[PDB]
């Protein structure tokens, strides 16, 4: 397989496409199987992206659309988009030559647009080809394999399992030794905020060398120096493929790694269609589990709810007691920012409901999953789907996350009676003295 980014350029599209690898057999201990599966998830992801771009060009002689799409098709002769894409400056795409051959192309980009070659007939791009991160990660990871086998680290792995608002990032910031350790986190904005918080005094201790995103670490590995970090701290580590974590522990050359997360919140979601990510693969294999049971964010009534989901006596430092309420609504058609202003951060459980509210004129709406890890003073939670919604259950991680974002209040607006209404109704009746007992 290709092990150099440059090699992806002009590679035949078919060479990167693989038949639904839903029939992959893995060998070796769990960590090795997880690492192999992670690489395969990337191969599958890239395969689907390339395959769809080829299909766009090959399924029909031509394709022209009037409405903007997630994909785009460029007519080379005129340099006009026959199918207009929602994104710009895509890192790569699939090229159709006049001889009707299909190759992947790392697109250069400025003139009046994409730089094309003489034998190019059409260029297809999509939201999946905006960046070539999968390609960069694959080339990095493949170089770490010896005959398809990865090396598992002997480092001790400690899971710091904490409740919502226990202050996981604050702990990392207090525990880390910036001169010897490395901190990794998924988002770019997330990494930047870790550095800003660390450097609040004005003294720079956190740099782009010791606090980075997971993608950056993987994509540029060995580009310069190969540093041996004493300890590795992975914020939001449970939101990554377990195979990815195993690789990070190994690649950092650490003696110990601390993975920060909450096993009751929303874990990594396998978004690769037709690709298996079994339950035994989904469980991160760690050596020790540290627990944090005090929330520095949630009111006492929410803490009462949390206490039913975690053993170990969940406590809160906040003086807020009651904070939840709920009411029925007929549907999106009956509400709008004017007639029904919604206080604070507006959240929905699904993308569909989110779109429905945005369509009503509400601004800055996000799904519960999208705001995992975030804190708000007031929350307006909305359920517009009347039919069954799996993720809305008494013991659902989504429900737990939806109730633990606020510090002041939360109001649930729903079109139908459901488990969350029951939860809120019960919390409203919990003994005031019982709520007093959670404060620490």
Residue pair 263/161 in contact by the 8 Å Cβ criterion: yes
Q: Which residue has the tokens 């159709």?
A: 96
Q: Read off the tokens for 49.
A: 């992206």
Q: Say if residues 384 and 333 touch (Cβ distance below 8 Å).
A: no
Residue closest to 131 by CA, chosen among 103, 89, 94: 89
- Rounded to whole angstroms, the Cα distance separating 56 from 85 reads 13
Angstrom distance (rounded) from CA 18 to CA 49: 11
Q: Are 439 and 427 in contact (CB under 8 A)?
A: no
- Residue given tokens 């914020």 in the structure block: 235
Q: What is the CATH number of domain 293-440?
A: 3.40.50.300
Which residues sit opposite 406 in a β-bridge?
376
Resolution in Å, one decimal, please. Answer: 1.9
Contact 253, 231 (CB under 8 A): no
Q: How far apart are CA 435 and CA 440, in angstroms?
A: 11
Give yes or no for a contact between 225 and 123, defined as CB atoms under 8 angstroms apart.
no
311 φ, ψ to 5°?
Answer: -90, 160
8 within 8 A of 106, measured Cβ to Cβ? yes
**The domains spanning 151-292 and 293-440 adopt the same CATH topology:** yes
Query: Do 181 and 187 contact (CB within 8 A), yes or no?
Result: no
Domain borders along the chain are 1-150, 151-292, 293-440
* Burial status of residue 66 (CB atoms within 10 A of its CB: 0-12, 13-18, 19 or more): exposed
What residues form DSSP beta bridges with 122?
75, 96
Binding residues for ATP: 165-170, 197, 296-297, 405, 426-429
User: 59 Cβ partners below 8 Å, 6+ apart?
Assistant: none
Q: Are 243 and 38 in contact (CB under 8 A)?
A: yes
Contacts of 18 (CB under 8 A, 6+ apart): 43, 44, 47
Tokens encoding 123: 């260029």
First to last CA, the chain: 56
On the CB side of 14, how many CA atoms lie within 13 Å of its CA?
A: 4
The residues with which 325 forms a beta bridge, in sequence order, are: 411
H/E element, 348: strand 345-348
> For 12, left (φ over 0), alpha (ψ -120 to 50), or beta?
beta
Q: Is 102 helix (H, G, I), strand (E, B) or coil?
A: strand
CA–CA dist 144, 156 (Å, integer): 20
Number of C-alpha atoms within 13 angstroms, CB side, residue 109? 9
Q: Using CA atoms, how far apart are residues 411 and 383, in angstroms rounded to an integer?
A: 11
Q: Which residues of 240-265 are buried (b: 16+ CB within 10 A; e: fewer)?
A: bbbbbbbbbbbbbebebbbbbbbebb
Integer Rg of the chain from CA: 24
Q: Which residues, listed in sequence order, are joined to residue 326 by a DSSP beta bridge?
A: 412
Q: Which residues are annotated as a binding site?
A: 165-170, 197, 296-297, 405, 426-429
Measured CA to CA in angstroms, residue 372 lies from 184, 253, 317, 347 at distances of: 17, 29, 21, 11
**Continuous H helices in 168-285:** 168-175, 188-198, 214-219, 242-251, 279-282
CB atoms within 10 A of CB 437: 14
Residue of 384, 73, 405 whose CA lies nearest to 265: 405
Q: What is the per-residue burial (b if ≥16 Cβ within 10 Å, else e) of 26-57?
A: eeeeebbbbbbbbbbbbbbbbbbbbbbbbebb
1-150 has CATH 3.30.450.420 classification? yes
What is the fold, at CATH topology level, of the domain defined by 151-292? Rossmann fold (3.40.50)
Are the C-beta atoms of 309 and 393 separated by less than 8 Å? Answer: no
Give CA torsion, residues 56, 57, 60, 61, to 10 deg. Answer: 160
**Using what technique was this structure determined?**
X-ray
Answer whether 93's CB lies under 8 Å from 53's CB.
Answer: yes
Cβ-contact 350, 385 below 8 angstroms: yes
Hey, which residues does 123 pair with through a beta bridge?
74, 95
Residue 200 token pair: 């609040």
Give the pairing type, strands 315-316 and 182-185: unpaired
Q: Which two tokens stand for residue 151?
A: 């090396």
The secondary structure of residue 85, as a DSSP letter, is B
What DSSP element (H or E) covers 207? none
Q: Six-digit token pair at 108? A: 């250069």
HSE-up of residue 383 (Cα within 13 Å, Cβ side): 26
Beta bridge partners of 95: 103, 123
Of the candidates 409, 422, 402, 412, which has an alpha carbon nearest to the alpha carbon of residue 266?
Answer: 402
Give kind and range of the element (H or E) at residue 305: helix 300-307
């Amino acid at each position: 397989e290709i092990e150099s980014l440059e090699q992806f350029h002009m590679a035949t599209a078919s060479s990167l496409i693989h038949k639904q690898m839903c029939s992959i057999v893995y060998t070796g201990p769990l960590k090795v199987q997880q690492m192999k599966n992670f690489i395969d998830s990337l191969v599958a992801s890239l395969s689907a992206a390339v395959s769809n771009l080829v299909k766009i060009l090959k399924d029909t002689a031509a394709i022209d659309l009037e409405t903007r799409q997630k994909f785009g098709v460029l007519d080379v002769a005129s340099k006009r988009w026959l199918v207009k894409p929602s994104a710009k400056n895509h890192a790569w795409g699939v090229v159709e030559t006049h001889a009707r051959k299909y190759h992947v192309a790392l697109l250069e980009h400025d003139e009046f647009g994409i730089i094309t070659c003489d034998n190019w007939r059409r260029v297809a791009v999509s939201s999946e080809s905006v960046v070539y991160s999968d390609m960069a990660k694959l080339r990095t990871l493949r170089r770490l394999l010896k005959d398809g086998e990865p090396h598992v680290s002997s480092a001790k792995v400690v899971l710091v399992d904490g409740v919502p608002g226990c202050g996981k990032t604050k702990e990392i910031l207090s525990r880390v030794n910036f001169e010897e350790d490395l901190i990794l986190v998924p988002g770019r904005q997330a990494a930047e905020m870790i550095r800003r918080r660390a450097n609040a005094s004005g003294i720079i201790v956190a740099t782009k060398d010791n606090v980075r995103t997971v993608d950056s670490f993987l994509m540029n590995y060995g580009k310069g120096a190969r540093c041996q970090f004493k300890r590795l701290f992975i914020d939001e580590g449970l939101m990554l493929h377990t195979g990815c974590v195993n690789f990070l522990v190994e690649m950092s050359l650490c003696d110990i790694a601390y993975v920060y997360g909450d096993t009751q919140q929303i874990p990594y979601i396998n978004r690769v269609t037709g690709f298996p990510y079994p339950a035994h693969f989904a469980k991160l294999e760690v050596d020790e589990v540290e627990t944090r049971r005090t929330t520095l964010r949630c009111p006492a009534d929410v803490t009462h709810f949390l206490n039913q989901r975690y053993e170990g006596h969940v406590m809160c430092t906040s003086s807020e007691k009651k904070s939840v309420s709920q009411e029925m609504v007929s549907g999106a058609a009956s509400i709008n920012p004017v007639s029904k202003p919604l206080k604070g951060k507006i959240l929905t459980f699904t993308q569909s409901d989110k779109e429905a509210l945005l369509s009503r004129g509400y601004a800055d709406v996000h799904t519960v999953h999208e705001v995992q890890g975030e804190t708000y003073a007031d929350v307006s939670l909305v359920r517009l789907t009347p039919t069954p919604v799996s993720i809305i259950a008494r013991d659902s991680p989504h429900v737990l996350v939806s109730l633990s974002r606020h510090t002041k209040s939360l109001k649930y607006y729903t079109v139908v009676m459901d488990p969350l209404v029951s939860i809120i109704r019960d919390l409203e009746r919990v003994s005031s003295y019982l709520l007093d007992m959670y404060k620490v």
